[PDB]
DNA sequence: ATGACCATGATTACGAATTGC
DNA sequence: TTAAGCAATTCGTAATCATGGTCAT
């Protein structure tokens, strides 16, 4: 429409005179056509945009597949003829799909047994399809020329034919590649196959291939296009994509770097009133607002589709409507005009990550950079909502319409589908918002070109694939190659690190904290650590070397080579992973704005995962070349110098060389040892720190460095990796207010106990005052005990599991929300509910925080007192007040039972005899609302009510109103359904209050 | 009369969750 | 066909084991 499309390249145009260089998006494997380059027909394509805007479709042609397998060792083996007859035989086996084989000069990537490169066969194939077969043909037995491979070889080097592509010509994902000056040719219109505004092909020879460093650092104006969708469904049923239709589907398309996207526009169901600042599109039935969609997304032409809970909810249930709907037109919308895009629906499973079920749909050419995965996998929080992620860091709790009235809203006036449209408007912005504060897609460009795998698989795969796509580089840049090691079935555990006894107690006393430098792999790069320089007794006595110089023996028992025999590839990776994080950091140091530092500090914390993922990856038996050795090896280094360290530290700072005091290792957590100098000062405490961390680096290997980090003044060690303190790096002003395991940091306690534990915190350390830190302890038991804690501070939020042996509470509620709404959460979501009174086991005691809210059923207040809150603040208080003052305050002498709007079972047709108040006299037979007996106090106890009463509504009129100014709407009714906004559950809490307290005011 | 048997705390074990390096 | 590692704490539920209250004897 005019300003859709992108910018058509110069009309003078041909496929001569030009260099298309375009920073590649997506990669792609298929077949070309019946014509055949370099005796193969598939390619790779490469969908990117150029500097300018032109999309463009290069086709990677005439690469095969070459599958490395060990040369026999026979003497008729190195006769052509036997290699001719051998070929012809592999030809004759699968029908012509071999295409030759290149002996070349190559050495195993597992140990180092001298310089000498073994004879290896690297075989053609014309369809890549074909290596698997013929490589698993190498490892059964299926072969039999000559009996060379009838017993089976360990083959090589085995990857996909995408990633192989990008290692041997070098196409680091998101990276800049350039075609030369006519090398290159253009597909005639009558073949071209795609949207794109290009569509070319070259020979992988001829192109070149740009690091992503200097001049070729730049991003290319990617179109990012954030939507969402809006459908109305029957009453109290989940949308289903059969019967309840999409009316609504807002779409944000952006720029990369841009400050506003330039299009907002709404396809709505029916009529629409304007509105300001956007545009929109009413149609008359779905099908034409789909097909217009679909329109749309192939005009806008974008490359990335970002969103939440888009490829779980948006893009299936579309493309689900669509096909029952019998639009059969509409799945084509993708960067290719003929293949369908469908939902494939697979499982991620990892320890630091969870099982998932993720319903991926095979959008060709467009990246996809779903914001709930991207937040799942990068930050740790409560909830992963919209609205809670939007309150967690955009700061807005905005209404959410609720979910019941949409489908009376599309059924009225044109300003009601206004003002749906307006919702849709909003959720379909807040993505992109939320990807431009993270920086999102410019950590994941970074990570992507730092690693050299395609975006795509920062968001359905591991931290193995990167690994793994660095090694087979600098392999390949080593002439080197990665046997195919069949995974072991499993192992229980390998002995990891020695965890220092924690000295309990609280700590006056500044304790400066020294910790390592990438711990990890600063072993690995200092040693000669790695899968090419793992020898053993055998082969030192054979090669016959010599101790300390050129081979060493680790504290594990494993044996090594120093870097006078071979350097490894672990080591050049690890220094690639700490040069990235070292400028990562040090944007981070030249940065001021408190958000951005902390998307600068996640994207340091993610480069120094990859860095500790090498670790996990040698020593991950689940996954390929499992090297056991090296992890143990550096666990064994780690443990030792880490006893090594707090020896040395113990020794040098003492009474005998002329300190003050005795330096003691108060606690140690595997790399750091937080030493008490025992100087009260902080400013002595941190240049003593800093000589002994200096000190402590001078006595190591030169990659390997101490590092004086932090002090704590007021320190709290509760137990073992579990601790609390300020956080001094300069000695004029604390940091903030560290707490390391403790139940306030944690996601499966409830938002009470973090506030509790932080007030506390506060309390004790930075004012230094026990006595009002009880005090409110006190005041906070005395409101759980009676009902003054809003619901939204009660609410456990725990991670839902595949399978489960012992049940469990969240377990159970998920199934019964199943049985009972119609549709619960998966696996892999955060379940959230508050524990209800009752007698039966504590996992049939769970509900949802809604279903509390509406029937109004009280909460285990006891649970939340003893279980909840009794144990953390007992274990940060007794090592100040003691054990038995800490627990004295814990004790139940004030209780209050509800027994209020719980109509049911039994609670309905009960009586309340209304006895007299401040003496609870059942002889109240004379009316009013106090006994003969203590009517003196008349005077007192409607004080206390009207005071009440007066609190009550006070907090009704602020809660309500302020409902009113967030809805924006004075006139109209707010019926809001968002359940993050801290002011939901307190509101209709202080009504019913109210209400009830003046019912009893009404008594006089 | 003497243990028998049922009911009620200690103790151990392990699943489940989360966080610390 | 695909998935970094381990160390550590805390809580819930069951299984098992010591010990007492009361009864046929
Ligand atoms: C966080 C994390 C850590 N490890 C291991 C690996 C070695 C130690 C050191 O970890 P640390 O976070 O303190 O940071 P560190 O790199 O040692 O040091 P600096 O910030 O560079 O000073 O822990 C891991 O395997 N996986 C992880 O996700
Ligand atoms: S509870 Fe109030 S502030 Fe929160 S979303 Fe609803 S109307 Fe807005
Ligand atoms: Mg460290
Ligand atoms: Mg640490
Ligand atoms: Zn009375």
Redesign the pocket.
């Known amino acids: 429409l005019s300003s859709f499309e992108r910018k058509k390249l110069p009309t003078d145009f041909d496929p001569s005179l030009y260099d298309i260089s375009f920073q590649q998006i997506d990669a792609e494997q298929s077949v070309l056509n019946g014509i055949k380059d370099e005796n193969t027909s598939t390619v790779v394509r490469f969908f990117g945009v150029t500097s300018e805007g032109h999309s463009v479709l290069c086709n990677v042609t005439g690469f095969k597949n070459y599958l490395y397998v060990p040369a026999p060792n026979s003497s008729d083996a190195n006769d052509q003829e036997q290699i001719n007859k051998f070929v012809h035989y592999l030809n004759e086996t699968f029908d012509h799909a071999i295409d030759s084989i290149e002996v070349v000069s190559k050495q195993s990537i597992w140990g180092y047994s001298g310089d000498t490169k073994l004879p290896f066969w690297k075989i053609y194939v014309t369809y890549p399809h074909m290596v698997?077969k013929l490589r698993t043909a190498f490892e059964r037995g299926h072969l039999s020329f000559n009996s060379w491979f009838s017993n089976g070889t360990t083959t090589y080097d085995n990857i996909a034919y995408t990633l192989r592509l990008m290692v041997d010509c070098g196409i680091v994902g998101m990276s800049w590649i350039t075609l030369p000056k006519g090398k290159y040719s253009m597909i005639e219109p009558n073949n071209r196959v795609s949207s794109c505004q290009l569509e070319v092909s070259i020979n992988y020879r001829n192109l070149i291939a740009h690091p992503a460093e200097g001049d070729w650092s730049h991003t290319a104006p990617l179109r990012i296009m954030s939507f969402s969708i809006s459908c109305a469904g029957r009453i109290g049923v989940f949308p289903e994509p059969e019967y309840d239709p999409v009316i609504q589907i807002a779409n944000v398309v952006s720029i990369a770097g841009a400050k506003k996207p330039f299009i907002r526009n709404v396809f709505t169901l029916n009529t629409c009133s304007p509105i300001t600042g956007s545009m929109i599109f009413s149609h008359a039935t779905e099908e034409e607002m789909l097909s217009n969609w679909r329109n749309f997304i192939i005009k806008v032409d974008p490359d990335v589709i970002i969103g939440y809970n888009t490829t779980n909810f948006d893009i299936p249930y579309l493309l689900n409507r669509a096909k029952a709907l019998k639009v059969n037109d509409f799945p084509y919308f993708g960067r290719l005009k003929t293949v369908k895009q469908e939902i494939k629906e697979s499982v991620?499973?990892?320890?630091?990550?969870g099982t998932r079920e993720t319903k991926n749909v095979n959008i060709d050419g467009r990246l996809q950079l779903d914001l709930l995965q991207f937040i799942q996998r990068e930050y740790?929080l409560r909830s992963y909502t919209l609205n809670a992620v939007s309150a967690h860091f955009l700061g807005e709790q905005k209404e959410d319409v609720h979910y019941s009235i949409i489908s009376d809203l599309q059924n009225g006036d044109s300003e009601t589908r206004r003002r749906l449209a307006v919702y849709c408007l909003k959720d379909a912005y807040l993505p992109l918002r939320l990807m431009e504060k993270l920086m999102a897609l410019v950590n994941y460009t970074e990570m992507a070109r730092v690693t050299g795998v395609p975006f795509s698989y920062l968001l359905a795969?591991?931290?193995?694939?990167k690994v793994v796509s660095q090694l087979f580089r600098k392999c390949l840049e080593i002439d080197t190659v990665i046997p195919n090691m069949q995974?072991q079935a499993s192992?229980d555990?390998?002995?990891?690190?020695?965890?220092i006894e924690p000295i309990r107690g609280y700590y006056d006393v500044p304790i400066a904290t020294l910790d390592f430098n990438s711990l990890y792999p600063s072993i690995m790069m200092a040693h000669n650590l790695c899968y090419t320089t793992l020898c053993n007794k055998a082969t030192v006595e054979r090669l016959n070397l010599k101790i300390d110089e050129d081979y060493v023996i680790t504290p594990n028992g494993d044996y090594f080579v120093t870097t006078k025999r071979r350097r490894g590839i672990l080591p050049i990776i690890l220094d690639e992973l700490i040069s990235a994080r070292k400028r990562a950091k040090k944007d981070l140091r030249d940065e001021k704005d408190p958000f951005k530092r902390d998307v600068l500090n996640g994207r340091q914390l993610a480069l120094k995962?990859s860095a500790?993922?090498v670790?996990?990856?040698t020593?991950?038996?689940?996954?390929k070349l499992p090297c056991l050795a090296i992890?143990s090896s550096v666990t064994a280094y780690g443990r030792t110098m880490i006893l090594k360290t707090k020896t040395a530290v113990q020794e040098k700072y003492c009474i005998k060389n002329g300190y003050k005091h005795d330096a003691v290792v108060v606690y140690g957590?595997?790399?750091?040892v937080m030493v008490k100098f025992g100087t009260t000062d902080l400013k002595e405490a941190m240049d003593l720190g800093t000589e002994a961390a200096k000190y402590v680096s001078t006595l190591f290997k030169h990659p390997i460095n101490l590092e004086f980090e932090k002090a704590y003044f007021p320190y709290l060690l509760?137990?073992?990796?579990?601790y609390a303190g300020l956080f001094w790096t300069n000695p004029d002003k604390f940091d903030k207010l560290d707490?390391?395991?403790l139940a306030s940091?944690?996601?499966?306690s409830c938002s009470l106990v973090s506030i509790v534990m932080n007030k506390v915190l506060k309390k004790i350390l930075i004012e230094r005052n026990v006595d009002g830190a009880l005090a409110f302890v006190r005041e906070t038991i005395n409101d759980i005990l009676h009902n003054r804690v809003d619901i939204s501070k009660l609410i456990i939020?725990?991670?839902?599991?595949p399978?489960?042996?012992?049940?469990?509470?969240?377990?159970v509620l998920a199934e019964r929300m199943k049985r009972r709404e119609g549709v619960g959460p998966n696996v892999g979501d955060?379940v959230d509910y508050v524990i209800i009174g009752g007698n039966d086991?504590?996992?049939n005691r769970a509900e949802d925080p809604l279903f509390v809210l509406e029937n109004n059923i009280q909460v285990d207040s006891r649970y939340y007192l003893t279980?909840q809150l009794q144990?953390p603040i007992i274990?940060i208080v007794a090592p100040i007040i003691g054990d038995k003052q800490a627990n004295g305050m814990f004790v139940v002498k004030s209780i209050k039972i509800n027994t209020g709007s719980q109509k049911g079972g039994l609670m309905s047709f009960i009586k309340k005899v209304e006895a007299c108040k401040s003496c609870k006299g059942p002889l109240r037979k004379g009316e009013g609302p106090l006994c003969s007996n203590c009517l003196a106090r008349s005077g007192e106890l409607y004080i206390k009510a009207l005071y009440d009463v007066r609190d009550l509504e006070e907090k009704y009129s602020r809660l309500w109103t302020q409902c009113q100014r967030c809805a924006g709407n004075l006139h109209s009714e707010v019926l809001c359904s968002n359940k993050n906004c801290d002011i939901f559950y307190m509101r209709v809490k202080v009504k019913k209050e109210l209400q009830e307290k003046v019912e009893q005011l009404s008594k006089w």
């Not at 555990?493 to 965890?499: C, H, I, M, N, P």
């Not at 957590?669 to 750091?672: G, R, Y």
């Not at 940091?745 to 499966?748: H, P």
């Open positions: 698997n991620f499973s990892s320890k630091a990550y740790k795969r591991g931290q193995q694939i995974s192992d555990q390998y002995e990891g690190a020695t965890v995962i500790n993922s670790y996990g990856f020593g991950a038996t689940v996954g992890s957590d595997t790399d750091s509760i137990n073992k990796k579990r707490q390391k395991g940091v944690r996601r499966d939020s725990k991670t839902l599991a399978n489960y042996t012992n049940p469990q509470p969240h377990a955060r086991k504590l996992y279980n144990n274990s």
